[PDB]
């Protein structure tokens, strides 16, 4: 038993919720939040600059810290620094940014870093301002993640249109 509210169960182990994700984090305290991040952790819009803004930019501080020391992430490629007053830990995930003309066979490669953490409260990747189809990152979640992932969609109209469309 956890204390996720509200959600729609899609499968044995994907959830979803419409629902900002920075509301929903503040609210349950998630062992881990997952952040829509870019490999630079330049934490400017989209989940990342609210998630950010919720930390007042304490997130960017520690980001900026990770990327003198250890450099840029990889496209598809995740690292956990923490979740301030949002979550015990943020895993930082970068999915492919189509308005970038990155490789949307990435997207699987990001969500494979879900599977090291038991339960997250997550977005969409690539979705939003990254450009991807959010019906195509839902199908690639499910048919990639096997640890239990709670999706927060923000946009009311988008959640109604995902959960219609879910095969
Ligand atoms: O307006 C739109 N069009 N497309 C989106 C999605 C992609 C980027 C943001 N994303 C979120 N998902 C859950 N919580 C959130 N808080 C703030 C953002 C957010 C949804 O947002």
Same mark, same amino acid.
């Given at each position: 038993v956890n204390?996720?509210?509200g959600y729609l169960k899609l499968t044995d182990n994907?959830?979803?919720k419409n629902a900002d994700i920075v509301e929903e984090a503040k609210k349950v305290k998630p062992t881990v939040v997952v952040n829509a991040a870019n490999v630079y952790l330049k934490h400017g819009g989209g989940v990342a600059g609210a998630l950010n803004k919720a930390t007042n930019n304490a997130m960017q501080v520690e980001s900026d810290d990770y990327i003198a020391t250890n450099g840029?992430?990889? =496209?598809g490629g995740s690292c956990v620094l923490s979740g301030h007053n949002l979550a015990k830990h943020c895993l930082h995930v970068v999915g492919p940014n189509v308005n970038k003309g990155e490789d949307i066979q990435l997207l699987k490669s990001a969500y494979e870093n879900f599977n090291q953490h038991?339960?997250?409260?997550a977005p969409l990747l690539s979705a939003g301002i990254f450009g991807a189809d959010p019906i195509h990152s839902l199908r690639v979640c499910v048919d990639? =993640?096997?640890t239990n992932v709670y999706l927060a969609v923000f946009d009311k109209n988008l959640y109604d249109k995902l959960v219609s469309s879910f095969l």
């Open positions: 204390s996720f509210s994907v959830y979803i840029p992430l990889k =496209v038991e339960v997250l409260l990639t =993640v096997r």
